[PDB]
Amino acid sequence: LFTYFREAIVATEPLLDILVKGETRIQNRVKLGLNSKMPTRFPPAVFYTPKELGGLGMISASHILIPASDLSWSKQTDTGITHFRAGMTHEDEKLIPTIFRYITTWENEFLDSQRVWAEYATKRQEAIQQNRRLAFEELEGSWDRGIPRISTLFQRDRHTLAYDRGHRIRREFKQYSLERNSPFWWTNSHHDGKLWNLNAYRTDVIQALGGIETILEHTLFKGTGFNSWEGLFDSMQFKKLTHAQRTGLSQIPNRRFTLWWSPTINRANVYVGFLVQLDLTGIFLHGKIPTLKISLIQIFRAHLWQKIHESIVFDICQILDGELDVL
């Protein structure tokens, strides 16, 4: 959506409304897989945390302020943005970065494209005048600018793609013969390149969730034994089993997502929630969240809680059997 309609979404009210509603739908799709949609139970750090740190890696487009104006006047004149409705308020003051700030708008792509292709045509005219072949160690810095990208000119299949014509409508009429067309029906990275780069987005998302410390205080990282944080980073679906058993195959990674964010899912700031106890251990849930309960049965099987407790008890006994005469 945002790499097609790039700047046309600022002056559009129903698209921002449906963005906020739709990202709320996606968060409630995640939360109704856990049968609990409490806002305190689910921080913004459990969704926008990238997929390497264990979170979902959702991209934010709905923590903006929606421009609000007088809806008796807004259907008459071009009202100035006189008020701001809050998009998706969390109780925290997490300023979650939005993808539109990390995408170069179209006018700011096209003026730059005319500039860098004037520079390329001038360097090519000079390299023909210099009789030197224009190696691509000079165009660096302007390697990812312009539509189409300069990085197209030195890809490994330029002689093959020399004869590719009519690719736009060939990729556009895939929707009449493919069941799941790619939503990038318009662009083709073989002929245009990657027209966006969101590897700077996730860095500022991590810096906006409070760095790595404030993310991992939500997680079950501290319960794991890691000598450093840096060492943190299904062959069953291919087996012919059953149509219904693929549900449990989907169930399996949901368990590790819930167990990774389990101290902030099973946390105590709960608006309403009854403190049940786990089966046979001393873990108090704050609501019948199923996959969390299954993961805590999974860790604490064989009365491992008891086999912790007893063990520590009798180990203290050995210490007190080691230190009888001292005390």
Partner 1 sequence: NIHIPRYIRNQPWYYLVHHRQLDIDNNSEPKIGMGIKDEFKLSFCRNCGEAGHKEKDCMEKPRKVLVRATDDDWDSRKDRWYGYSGKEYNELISKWERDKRNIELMKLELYKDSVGSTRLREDKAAYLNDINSTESNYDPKSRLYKTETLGAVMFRRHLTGEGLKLNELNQFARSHAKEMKEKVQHVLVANPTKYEYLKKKREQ
Partner 2 sequence: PERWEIRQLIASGISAQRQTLPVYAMRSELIQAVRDNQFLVIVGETGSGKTTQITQYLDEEGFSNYGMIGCTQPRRVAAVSVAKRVAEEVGCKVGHDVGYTIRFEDVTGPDTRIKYMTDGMLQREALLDPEMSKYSVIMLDEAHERTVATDVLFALLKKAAIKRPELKVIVTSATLNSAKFSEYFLNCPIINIKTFPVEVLYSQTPQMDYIEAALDCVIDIHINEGPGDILVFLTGQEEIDSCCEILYDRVKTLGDSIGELLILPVYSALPSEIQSKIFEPTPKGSRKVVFATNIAETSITIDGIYYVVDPGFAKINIYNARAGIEQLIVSPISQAQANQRKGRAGRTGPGKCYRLYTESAFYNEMLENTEIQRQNLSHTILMLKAMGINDLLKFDFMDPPPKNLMLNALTELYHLQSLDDEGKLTNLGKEMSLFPMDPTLSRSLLSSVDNQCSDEIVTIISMLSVQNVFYRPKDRQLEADSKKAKFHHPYGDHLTLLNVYTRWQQANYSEQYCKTNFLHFRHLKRARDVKSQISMIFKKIGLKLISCHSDPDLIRKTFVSGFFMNAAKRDSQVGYKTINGGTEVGIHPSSSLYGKEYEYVMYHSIVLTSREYMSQVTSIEPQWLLEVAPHFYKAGDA
Partner RNA sequence: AGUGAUCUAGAAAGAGAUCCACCUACUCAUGU
Confirm or reject binding of residue 157 to RNA (CB under 7 A): no
d(CA 4, CA 1): 6
Q: How many residues bind partner 2 (CB under 8 A)?
A: 20
Q: Which two tokens stand for residue 118?
A: 């004037």
At 84, is the secondary structure helix, strand, or coil?
strand
Alpha helices in the chain (DSSP H): 13-31, 106-129, 167-172, 201-208, 211-218, 246-260, 262-265, 290-299, 304-322
- Binder of residue 234, out of partner 1, partner 2, RNA, none (CB less than 5 to 8 A by kind): none
Least separation in angstroms between CB 212 and partner 1: 5
Contact 285, 276 (CB under 8 A): yes
d(CA 276, CA 65): 39
d(CA 266, CA 255): 14
**DSSP code of residue 193:** -
Least separation in angstroms between CB 272 and partner 2: 60
Nearer to partner 2, 78 or 157 (CB): 157
Question: At which residue do the structure tokens 């799941």 appear?
Answer: 180
- Binder of residue 318, out of partner 1, RNA, partner 2, none (CB less than 5 to 8 A by kind): partner 1
Q: Is 148 buried (19+), middle (13-18) or exposed (0-12) by CB count in 10 A?
A: middle
Least separation in angstroms between CB 284 and partner 1: 14
Confirm or reject binding of residue 162 to partner 2 (CB under 8 A): yes
**DSSP code of residue 59:** P
Q: Is 275 buried (19+), middle (13-18) or exposed (0-12) by CB count in 10 A?
A: exposed
Strand partners, 284: 277
Confirm or reject binding of residue 64 to RNA (CB under 7 A): no
Residue type, 12: T
Contact 170, 182 (CB under 8 A): no
Confirm or reject binding of residue 243 to partner 2 (CB under 8 A): no
Positions 129 through 148 that interact with partner 2 (CB under 8 A): 130-131, 133, 146-148
Nearer to partner 2, 161 or 232 (CB): 161
Residues that bind partner 1 (CB under 8 A): 50, 52, 199-204, 206-207, 211-213, 216-217, 221-222, 225-233, 268-269, 310-311, 314-315, 317-319, 321-322
Positions 111 through 130 that interact with partner 2 (CB under 8 A): 113-114, 117-118, 120-121, 124, 130
Q: Which of 246, 301, 307, 309 binds RNA (CB under 7 A)?
A: 246
Nearer to partner 2, 158 or 303 (CB): 158
- Binder of residue 322, out of partner 2, partner 1, RNA, none (CB less than 5 to 8 A by kind): partner 1
Q: Which two tokens stand for residue 140?
A: 């660096």
Rg (CA), the chain: 28
How remote is the C-alpha of 113 from its chain's centroid? 29
Confirm or reject binding of residue 240 to RNA (CB under 7 A): no
Confirm or reject binding of residue 245 to RNA (CB under 7 A): no
**DSSP code of residue 163:** G
Least separation in angstroms between CB 148 and RNA: 15
Longest dimension (CA), the chain: 96
Nearer to RNA, 269 or 298 (CB): 269
Nearer to partner 2, 145 or 293 (CB): 145
Residues that bind partner 2 (CB under 8 A): 113-114, 117-118, 120-121, 124, 130-131, 133, 146-148, 152-153, 158-162
Residues that bind RNA (CB under 7 A): 24, 31, 35-41, 83, 86, 88-91, 135-136, 154-156, 179-180, 182, 194, 198-199, 243-244, 246-247, 271-274, 286-289
